[PDB]
Ligand binder design. Structure first.
Ligand SMILES: Cc1ccc(-c2cc3c(N[C@@H](Cc4ccccc4)P(=O)(O)O)ncnc3s2)cc1Cl
Ligand SMILES: Cc1ccc(-c2cc3c(N[C@@H](Cc4ccccc4)P(=O)(O)O)ncnc3s2)cc1Cl
Ligand SMILES: Cc1ccc(-c2cc3c(N[C@@H](Cc4ccccc4)P(=O)(O)O)ncnc3s2)cc1Cl
Ligand SMILES: Cc1ccc(-c2cc3c(N[C@@H](Cc4ccccc4)P(=O)(O)O)ncnc3s2)cc1Cl
Lengths: 343, 343
């Protein structure tokens, strides 16, 4: 019994309540059609993932709040904030999929590729962001942690946008970018692109909902959860190329799109001058033959083997960090995450 | 002496302070390059308009706050919130210009058309939105009206996104859309697309900064300022086609892009069955010959003459509304706006 698997059904049943509430703007019929589009956008975009971000809010809330203080209303609010993290994710996916020229995401066609959508998806993305603060207001405005949450969601959006900015600056389309594919850069991107919103946001949200706002207590959780995010994104980079797309649900574009991948960084640290030139001639181009040559060089440098060795050392390191920095929180908050992202 | 013309210089000099403060993330050098991109985005996007939104915050603040309560610090905060409205505008412009396939805006090439930008502009737009809440925090977090402002900016973003959603649903590319070009629809779009953020937001912001949070006092200002926004957008639609682009600064795309324009609505209300078919065969297509045929039909129905007659009746109506609903606020708050948007 994973604490996630158990709390999942109740979380998904709540979604209908989220949608019913964000569409009922019933005293405003003039915008009826727009609420219909909003409903379509949520059903397509916020559904069909494993929900691990939002569930993490709901799990962590159960582990942190004295069970006497778990009234039906307090639960609603945890389900909602969890959903708020999912909406945040759906905002970044919809928009990132346009920017990266993605085909597919979680097994179906990307929202912007659906006929009759295209660049209108920009506006659709923006609405998904809007919906967060509409829910925080409708469910948490009388709560003492309300402002803390609003500030947490916006700070998380700013840091992800900063991370996306680095990702894009490091990966100019059409140009040879290998010079700027460094470890220092790589760590910076993933810290800001992924780690803050995927790991810190959901735990931090639950922490606040439990009246734990201590600056040192948020610093210490952050110190664990950012390293968890670093490993997670390194695995996302690994699976972008070597994953099984009946599992990953998406096609890898990192080579064609010219991304500062963990893989390309590792490959640069190991290449002969000769191998550098294979990579230089083949990386960052839409041609299937050139993406194949890169995968072949990665496999010749046994990077999948280097990834397996990093997944080992990372697990040990992360565990040593939960020793150092979990207290006073139940270690189970952290361990439940580690269980979910190391197979 | 327009109260706007006078307060302008001081407002623009402040911009350098906005940029210095949002880039000084000086204890975070790893994201240096991203702050550089942020700086470029602000200089290109938030500069070269007439600033009327943001100035309206600063004017209204002077008219509403007892001059004893106008300390140097209280001014900084008014300049900042004003700038916050400008950043909001710059967010919607950058993104709307991608969606509408705009060439130019305020006399220069659209940000997304600049070589090496393209769809990365989506992320750039998102950062401009982020910057608002970064400034509200840095300048207003200790103020009693802080939450009121955060809620005001987000509500304004949601209503604009709803309005954009209606605009897009009413204007499907490739299809004949004349059926859905009604007055009821037209008014709904502009209320939500333009009026809330262009008129209500800046006055409402100043009102809050002056401790005026009364529900009836915000209802009454809103009642005036939304009708001002309706007229403003009807004039924006008129100038989209009949404007002087050394004045308007932008090329009109409303015909090619298939927009529920005031012009197309008025034209539909007046056409012979025959003229309907000219419009039906020529509206919503990229071909210069078909956009020319539409302008010719508009000119044959003396719509520019109908626009002049509406600009008359609107001015009278708006003035009768400031009679009814300005109190207890100085009428000058409202009149200063009317002066700025009727020539
Ligand atoms: C979460 C997690 C998931 C998978 C692993 C794996 C480790 C490993 C392995 N490790 C050897 C070392 C190794 C061998 C080949 C390639 C990389 C490392 P060992 O340390 O001698 O057991 N050899 C073959 N397959 C595997 S899978 C470790 C962890 Cl901590
Ligand atoms: C904060 C957070 C963010 C994302 C996740 C995800 C985990 C996961 C997954 N994990 C599987 C395990 C796993 C499979 C392959 C590689 C790594 C872990 P599970 O054990 O079925 O949950 N399999 C597919 N997609 C995802 S997304 C988990 C968390 Cl706690
Ligand atoms: C803010 C503002 C800006 C311009 C106008 C104009 C009105 C008008 C006009 N009005 C005539 C009526 C009219 C004539 C032709 C076309 C439309 C209306 P009138 O009422 O007899 O003076 N005839 C020619 N030119 C103009 S410009 C009115 C307003 Cl209150
Ligand atoms: C809330 C708000 C939003 C936008 C505006 C704008 C006004 C304006 C303008 N007005 C000129 C007058 C004018 C010119 C043509 C048509 C209408 C008014 P001005 O008198 O020089 O300020 N000329 C070009 N662009 C703009 S944008 C003003 C406000 Cl008080």
């Amino acid at each position: 019994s994973d604490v996630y698997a158990q709390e999942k059904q109740d979380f998904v049943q709540h979604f209908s309540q989220i949608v019913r509430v964000l569409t009922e703007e019933m005293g405003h019929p003039e915008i009826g059609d727009a609420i219909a589009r909003l409903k379509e956008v949520l059903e397509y975009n916020a559904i069909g993932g494993k929900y691990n971000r939002g569930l993490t809010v709901v799990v962590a809330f159960r582990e942190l709040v004295e069970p006497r203080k778990q009234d039906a209303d307090s639960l609603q609010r945890a389900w909602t904030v969890g959903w708020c993290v999912e909406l945040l994710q759906a905002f970044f996916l919809v928009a990132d999929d346009i920017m990266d020229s993605s085909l597919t995401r979680r097994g179906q066609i990307c929202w912007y590729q659906k006929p009759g959508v295209g660049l209108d998806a920009i506006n659709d993305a923006n609405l998904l962001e809007a919906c967060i603060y509409r829910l925080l207001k409708l469910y948490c405005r009388e709560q003492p942690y309300y402002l803390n949450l609003i500030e947490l969601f916006l700070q998380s959006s700013y840091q992800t946008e900063i991370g996306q900015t680095l990702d894009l600056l490091t990966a100019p389309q059409g140009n040879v970018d290998l010079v700027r594919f460094t470890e220092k850069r790589y760590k910076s991107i993933v810290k800001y692109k992924t780690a803050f919103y995927s790991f810190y946001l959901p735990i931090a949200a639950a922490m606040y909902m439990a009246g734990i706002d201590g600056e040192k207590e948020h610093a210490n959780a952050k110190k664990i959860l950012l390293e968890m995010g670093e490993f997670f994104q390194i695995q996302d980079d690994y699976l972008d190329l070597f994953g099984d797309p009946s599992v990953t649900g998406k096609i890898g574009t990192d080579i064609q799109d010219n991304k500062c991948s963990w893989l390309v960084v590792q490959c640069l640290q190991r290449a002969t001058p000769e191998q550098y030139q294979i990579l230089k001639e083949n990386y960052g181009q839409k041609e299937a033959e050139k993406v194949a040559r890169v995968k072949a060089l990665y496999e010749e440098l046994d990077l999948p083997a280097v990834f397996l060795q990093y997944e080992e050392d990372s697990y040990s390191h992360i565990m040593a960090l939960i020793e150092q920095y979990a207290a006073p929180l139940p270690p189970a908050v952290f361990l439940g995450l580690a269980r979910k992202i190391y197979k």
